[PDB]
Amino acid sequence: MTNIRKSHPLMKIINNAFIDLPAPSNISSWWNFGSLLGICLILQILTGLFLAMHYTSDTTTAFSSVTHICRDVNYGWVIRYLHANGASMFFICLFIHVGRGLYYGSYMFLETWNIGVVLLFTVMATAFMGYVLPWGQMSFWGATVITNLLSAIPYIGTDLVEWIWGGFSVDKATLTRFFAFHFILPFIITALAAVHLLFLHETGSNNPTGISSDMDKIPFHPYYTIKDILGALFMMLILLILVLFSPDLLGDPDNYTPANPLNTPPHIKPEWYFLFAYAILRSIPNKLGGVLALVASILILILMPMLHTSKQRSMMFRPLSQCLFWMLVADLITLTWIGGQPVEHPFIIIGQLASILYFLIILVLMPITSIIENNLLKW
Amino acid sequence: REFGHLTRMRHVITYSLSPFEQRAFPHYFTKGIPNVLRRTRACILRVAPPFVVFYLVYTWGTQEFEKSKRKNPAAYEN
Amino acid sequence: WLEGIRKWYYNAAGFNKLGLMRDDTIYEDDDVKEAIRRLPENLYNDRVFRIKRALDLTMRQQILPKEQWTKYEEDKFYLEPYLKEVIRERKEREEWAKK
Amino acid sequence: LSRFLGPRYRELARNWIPTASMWGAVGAVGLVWATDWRLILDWVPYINGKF
Amino acid sequence: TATYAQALQSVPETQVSQLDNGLRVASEQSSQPTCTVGVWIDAGSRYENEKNNGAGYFVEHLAFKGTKNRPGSALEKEVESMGAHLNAYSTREHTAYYIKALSKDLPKAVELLADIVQNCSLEDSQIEKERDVILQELQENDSSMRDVVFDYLHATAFQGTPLAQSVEGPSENVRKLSRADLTEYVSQHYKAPRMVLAAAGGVEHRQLLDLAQKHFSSLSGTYVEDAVPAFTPCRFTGSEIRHRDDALPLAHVAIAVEGPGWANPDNVPLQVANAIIGHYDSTYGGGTHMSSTLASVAATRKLCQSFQTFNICYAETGLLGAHFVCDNMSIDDMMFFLQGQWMRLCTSATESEVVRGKNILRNALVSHLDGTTPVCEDIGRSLLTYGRRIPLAEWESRIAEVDASVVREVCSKYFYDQCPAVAGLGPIEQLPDYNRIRSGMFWLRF
Amino acid sequence: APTLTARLYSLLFRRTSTFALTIAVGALFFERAFDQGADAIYEHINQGKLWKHIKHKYEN
Numbered sequence A: 001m002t003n004i005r006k007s008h009p010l011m012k013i014i015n016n017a018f019i020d021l022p023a024p025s026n027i028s029s030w031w032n033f034g035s036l037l038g039i040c041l042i043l044q045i046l047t048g049l050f051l052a053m054h055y056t057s058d059t060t061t062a063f064s065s066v067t068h069i070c071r072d073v074n075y076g077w078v079i080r081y082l083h084a085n086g087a088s089m090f091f092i093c094l095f096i097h098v099g100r101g102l103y104y105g106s107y108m109f110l111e112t113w114n115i116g117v118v119l120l121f122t123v124m125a126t127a128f129m130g131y132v133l134p135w136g137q138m139s140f141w142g143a144t145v146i147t148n149l150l151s152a153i154p155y156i157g158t159d160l161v162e163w164i165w166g167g168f169s170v171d172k173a174t175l176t177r178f179f180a181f182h183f184i185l186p187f188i189i190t191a192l193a194a195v196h197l198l199f200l201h202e203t204g205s206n207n208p209t210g211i212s213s214d215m216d217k218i219p220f221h222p223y224y225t226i227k228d229i230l231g232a233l234f235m236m237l238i239l240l241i242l243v244l245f246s247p248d249l250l251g252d253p254d255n256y257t258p259a260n261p262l263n264t265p266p267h268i269k270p271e272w273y274f275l276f277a278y279a280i281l282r283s284i285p286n287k288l289g290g291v292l293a294l295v296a297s298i299l300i301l302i303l304m305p306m307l308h309t310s311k312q313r314s315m316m317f318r319p320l321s322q323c324l325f326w327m328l329v330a331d332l333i334t335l336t337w338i339g340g341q342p343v344e345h346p347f348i349i350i351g352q353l354a355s356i357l358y359f360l361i362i363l364v365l366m367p368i369t370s371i372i373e374n375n376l377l378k379w
Numbered sequence B: 001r002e003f004g005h006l007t008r009m010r011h012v013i014t015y016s017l018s019p020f021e022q023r024a025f026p027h028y029f030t031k032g033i034p035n036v037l038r039r040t041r042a043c044i045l046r047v048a049p050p051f052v053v054f055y056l057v058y059t060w061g062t063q064e065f066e067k068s069k070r071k072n073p074a075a076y077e078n
Numbered sequence C: 001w002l003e004g005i006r007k008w009y010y011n012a013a014g015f016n017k018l019g020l021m022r023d024d025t026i027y028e029d030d031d032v033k034e035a036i037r038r039l040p041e042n043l044y045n046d047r048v049f050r051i052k053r054a055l056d057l058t059m060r061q062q063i064l065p066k067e068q069w070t071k072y073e074e075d076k077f078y079l080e081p082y083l084k085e086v087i088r089e090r091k092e093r094e095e096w097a098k099k
Numbered sequence D: 001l002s003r004f005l006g007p008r009y010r011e012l013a014r015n016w017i018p019t020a021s022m023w024g025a026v027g028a029v030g031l032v033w034a035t036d037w038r039l040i041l042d043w044v045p046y047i048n049g050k051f
Numbered sequence E: 001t002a003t004y005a006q007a008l009q010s011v012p013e014t015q016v017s018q019l020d021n022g023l024r025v026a027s028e029q030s031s032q033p034t035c036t037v038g039v040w041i042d043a044g045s046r047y048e049n050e051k052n053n054g055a056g057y058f059v060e061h062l063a064f065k066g067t068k069n070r071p072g073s074a075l076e077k078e079v080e081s082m083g084a085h086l087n088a089y090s091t092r093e094h095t096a097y098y099i100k101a102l103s104k105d106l107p108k109a110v111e112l113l114a115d116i117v118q119n120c121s122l123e124d125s126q127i128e129k130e131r132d133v134i135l136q137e138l139q140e141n142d143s144s145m146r147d148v149v150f151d152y153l154h155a156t157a158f159q160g161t162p163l164a165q166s167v168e169g170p171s172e173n174v175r176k177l178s179r180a181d182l183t184e185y186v187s188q189h190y191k192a193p194r195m196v197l198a199a200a201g202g203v204e205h206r207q208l209l210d211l212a213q214k215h216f217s218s219l220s221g222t223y224v225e226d227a228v229p230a231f232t233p234c235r236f237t238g239s240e241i242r243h244r245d246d247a248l249p250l251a252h253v254a255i256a257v258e259g260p261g262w263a264n265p266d267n268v269p270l271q272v273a274n275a276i277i278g279h280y281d282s283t284y285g286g287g288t289h290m291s292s293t294l295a296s297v298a299a300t301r302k303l304c305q306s307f308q309t310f311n312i313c314y315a316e317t318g319l320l321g322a323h324f325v326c327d328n329m330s331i332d333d334m335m336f337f338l339q340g341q342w343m344r345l346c347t348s349a350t351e352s353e354v355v356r357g358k359n360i361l362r363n364a365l366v367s368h369l370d371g372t373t374p375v376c377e378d379i380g381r382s383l384l385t386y387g388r389r390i391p392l393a394e395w396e397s398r399i400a401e402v403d404a405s406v407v408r409e410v411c412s413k414y415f416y417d418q419c420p421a422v423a424g425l426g427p428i429e430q431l432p433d434y435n436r437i438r439s440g441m442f443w444l445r446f
Numbered sequence F: 001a002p003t004l005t006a007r008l009y010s011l012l013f014r015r016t017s018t019f020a021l022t023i024a025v026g027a028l029f030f031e032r033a034f035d036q037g038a039d040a041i042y043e044h045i046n047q048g049k050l051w052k053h054i055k056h057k058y059e060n
Ligand code: HEM
Pocket: A041, A044, A045, A046, A047, A048, A049, A050, A051, A052, A055, A066, A080, A083, A084, A087, A090, A123, A126, A127, A130, A131, A132, A133, A134, A182, A183, A186, A187, A189, A251
């Protein structure tokens, strides 16, 4: 005889992936967010599939269809606001996850990190296309603002922008396309996640110390399953607090006024997750420069493994790098606020300085600080 | 990377009591609280300072924007 | 002067608190892995136990007693000569590859 | 990156430069053909007959 | 303070003279008190048809077993009593008999060689005994995996041509051979114009020429009833012969592409390229640090017990490739690395490795031509194949001409997008299918 | 004497970069040629029906 868990092929894959995977014993709660990201992906897929059963993508019927979901559909409001706030929970977990990777030097797993960057771009595209689907004033005008950024691209420009729009401007074709792309992309994310886990399993999981943990490994199933379940319960606590107690906390009100192409909303701002890139885009006056800066903000992560000059993987034993990292986090918060606020005298200089600081910290300050630390440790 | 052949370790002895024979929350407050204070003391010096700067910036920016909106009496003077 | 700042960093970095030594915290790249496999068995076992104890301490979010912290002077760079030899040999191979 | 600044690597670059140039020519022709880039194609004889 | 050039210039020069019958007498004179005198005959399996295949091996077997002048024991008794060593080697293209002996015994050695070549008894009883012996040795050679694999390589690559035939020949021919056939083989293929008498060591060319005139003059180049054998160019067919015997411990694979003939000037650059590819055996001390990328990888991964590159050349065609013995599960990786090295030499060869290969070839040439046996073998084979003994200085000049560009050009001509011939023996299931091996012969990048 | 196919192999087909150059240029010219020829074939098969044939009678 043999153990079915080991022997059976699908059961073997599941066992190696999740049940008996060798896991570092010291991985902290920061490591729980990846499973929280998977839970968010599953919850978003289910909730959006139940929303899609009641959502029509025609410009005539989209807003009325979301109102039908909220009012007439049984428990439809729960589903709709679960989806809306789950997007925010997803982005919060993604940011904390990438922050953990940066702080603990998890980017040394090159393939996993690059697949994660691809995943981040995919998720952002999914969220942006989804926000347009309710077809509110904010959805329409944010789509118009963001998609018009592609026009800056030299030469191809307007051709690409109109190809995406399906016409001269954002309209019924854009909404239907975005519903289709929004539906399809999360599944592509669900496959990229599997590739991510395969690459990670090749190299294991990094520890908070940053020192190999082959000496101290604990089976995943007894300990980390329960830890992830506790993390999921806490995430449900926060998400359901948003869904029920404060359903409309993270969303702009002006998305409840049906979209009017002839009137701009009082303020046009992206969702909270995208605001940090919006501030960087606004900081640079030239349109193409702004678009390139917005791209580089995410793409600078790819260069992180190359820019690692320290001899220690983690920042746990690197205090100055810790100070720089928390400077970067505060700078990202500042960029979020600047993206929220209008483009006026006080905020403009703040945003320009913040973007300069973000790029400078990632590209210059951190590697030189790591070199200085190496010198201090007699390296 | 199966469990059997992960690494080479020699002459390490580990004793681990079972969950049922041991308390789940041993000295959760008596020892937990002093440990948390130690951890906060070390972390606060590095984590906090950068966020304090943001609060100064947020307060200054909010005040400055309000000052800009307020009327300048000299402009309507004369 | 410089030794004071170097001592400050040694205390600021917590590998002493966990009982580790500086070479224990090095990122295990290929040169470091070759150096580790080149270590004498006594040093290798000492390193493995130190890292295991550090991992266990971090797991429970605890630190070693103050008296048992590593000392800046007492810290010994066991891996530096082997790693230097490994790096030198890699450099020689690269130099032959260049021309 | 200093590893690749030597005479042998220069020789390898010399050996592969013609093939890389041919691959670039393939890419350029493929792009023009796939996108029907009239700016280039209009000069191409007997293809300018289109449009 | 002699230099390699000066030492090459100071090498004793081979002197070639021809008897009226057509025998060519060549000599290299040294101060050594020992000499090697041998007759190299342009006869081999490639000159044999299906019915008489293996006849040359039979004649070589019974060549030293007696002559009309001296019975079977007498010849051995003379050769041993004077302390000489008598040996023969038969190849698909050449047959040789050489005697190692003291310089003072040169006349008796020449007499014995003449008696062996011309007045060979070919007695029937000795014929039967040698038939028994030859069958037993055919059974023995089956054990030698390398010889079996190379015979398979010749069979598949030169299928339908005389070169495919083995030197020993089929067992059926061995049992069916008769004294008439052996006599006919000697008459047709052993001729003065097709023979070279070569000497090395303490041999005076005048003395050798006089002795050859005394003893070898009778031999004639006329063919009875104007029956003259005609040389036939041999087609090279890309093919795969796989004898799968999983019982065998290790797998032998030999892969080759058609190569230059003996006289083709491209032989030198191909030899330099093969030196670049190198040779490896598990006993080799160098292991991982060995310059050859294939050798280093095989040592690091223990891919193969042994791998060697061969440049087998015949008059109009040749087999250029490698032979590697490897585990059942490492054949595919070894093939990948070998073909990768071939394509890398073809496309992106570099000057430093070219210099290393040129020095390796120079040292191999100089070392091989050491001692009376190797020097005499070189003289005879060069006269038969090149029509002349290429001096070491000429070899050095041709090697110096070789550059990375020349190596790339020749390796592209012979190795790139050319259908290979593959022979496999043993646990060869992992050996790639012929389509995959052929695909390995070209790079999509290039 | 090299044949036409042997000349093609040596000049273009041997090195895959020239092989792809042949493929792409032939693709461009074959698109042109085949589209022209098949359009002519269909127009001949339906001569006098297609609007293009009869557009003149009603334009201007
Ligand atoms: C996988 C990650 C996903 C993310 C990050 C995401 C994000 C979003 C966001 C931000 C919205 C707009 C929220 C609002 O109503 O104001 C939305 C709407 C929507 N999403 Fe999701 N979504 C995801 C997956 C899916 C999937 C797989 C489906 C499959 C049908 C789906 C279906 C929908 C539908 C129908 C709407 C419009 C209904 C409504 O406005 O309430 N979503 N999505």
